[PDB]
C-alpha cells in the first residue's frame, strides 16, 4: 500500500455501497481520457480538463444544472475497452488550459462488454461504449449505466497500479526539469 493512496482513501469514500443510481434529475456525460496518467492525476487532485470544445459543453451543462441536479462524468480511457470510474463535476471551468473540480465516486474497471447493450438514441443508437468525449447520455440510459457500474464486482482498478503511476509522474517531472535546465 502506497502512503499517498492511503491518504486518498481516508479522505474519500470510494465505491460507496449506497449510491443512488435512480436519479431524479441531472445530466450525465462520457469522458474519453487520453491516458491512464490523466485518470491517476485526476483522482489525486480532484480536477479534470477536457478539450476546448468539451470544456465549453461541460461548463454550460454545469451552469444550466445549478441547484437542479448533479452532473456525472463516466470515465473511459481511449482504446482501453473498459470504463474506469465515475466522478461528479463540482465547479464550472476555470480558464486561468482550463480545469474544473471533480469528486471521484467510483474507481473501478467495468468491461465494455458489460455496458454495450445500452444504446444512445441521441448518438445514432450506437452503444454507450462507442461514445466520443462529452457525449451526453439520456437520463434513463444513464441510470442503467450507473446501476451496472455501481453494482459491478470489479476485479481491477487503476489503484492496482498506483505506485507505478506515481513513479511515471515523478520520473517524467525529473526528465522535464532537466530538459528545461539545458535550454
Asked if residue 174 is part of any domain, the answer here is no
Asked if residue 35 is part of any domain, the answer here is yes
Asked if residue 144 is part of any domain, the answer here is yes
The residue range of the domain holding 78 is 19-153
Helix segments in 12-136, DSSP class H? 36-45, 52-64
SS3 of residue 146 by DSSP = helix
SS3 of residue 166 by DSSP = helix
Residue 74 CB neighbours (<10 A): 26
SS3 of residue 102 by DSSP = strand
Q: Give the whole-angstrom CA distance, residue 70 versus residue 166.
A: 31
Asked if residue 5 is part of any domain, the answer here is no
Asked if residue 171 is part of any domain, the answer here is no
Number of domains in the chain: 1
DSSP 56: H
SS3 of residue 86 by DSSP = strand
Q: Give the whole-angstrom CA distance, residue 40 versus residue 168.
A: 10
Asked if residue 172 is part of any domain, the answer here is no
| Method used to obtain the model | X-ray
Asked if residue 146 is part of any domain, the answer here is yes
Q: Give the whole-angstrom CA distance, residue 100 versus residue 41.
A: 13
Q: Report CA 96 to chain centroid distance, whole Å.
A: 22
Resolution (A): 2.0
Binding residues: 32-34, 38, 48-49, 78
Residue 67 Cα distances to 25, 64, 90, 142, 180, angstroms: 11, 9, 12, 20, 45
Q: Report CA 180 to chain centroid distance, whole Å.
A: 31
Binding residues for RNA: 32-34, 38, 48-49, 78
Amino acid at each position: 500500500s502506497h502512503p499517498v493512496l492511503e491518504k486518498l482513501k481516508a479522505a474519500h469514500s470510494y465505491n460507496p455501497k449506497e449510491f443512488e443510481w435512480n436519479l431524479k434529475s441531472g445530466r450525465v456525460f462520457i469522458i474519453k481520457s487520453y491516458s491512464e496518467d490523466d485518470i491517476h492525476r485526476s483522482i489525486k487532485y480532484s480536477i479534470w480538463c477536457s478539450t476546448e470544445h468539451g470544456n465549453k459543453r461541460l461548463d454550460s451543462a454545469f451552469r444550466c444544472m445549478s441547484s437542479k441536479g448533479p452532473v456525472y462524468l463516466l470515465f473511459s480511457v481511449n482504446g482501453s475497452g473498459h470504463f474506469c470510474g465515475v466522478a461528479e463535476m463540482k465547479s464550472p471551468v476555470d480558464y486561468n488550459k482550463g480545469k474544473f473540480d471533480v469528486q471521484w465516486i467510483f474507481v473501478k474497471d467495468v468491461p465494455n462488454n458489460q455496458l454495450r447493450h445500452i444504446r444512445l438514441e441521441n448518438n445514432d443508437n450506437k452503444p454507450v461504449t462507442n461514445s466520443r468525449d462529452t457525449q451526453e447520455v439520456p437520463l434513463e440510459k444513464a441510470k442503467q449505466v450507473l446501476k451496472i457500474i455501481s453494482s459491478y464486482k470489479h476485479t481491477t482498478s487503476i489503484f492496482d497500479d498506483f505506485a507505478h503511476y506515481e513513479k511515471r509522474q515523478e520520473e517524467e517531472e525529473v526528465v522535464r526539469k532537466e530538459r528545461q535546465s539545458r535550454n
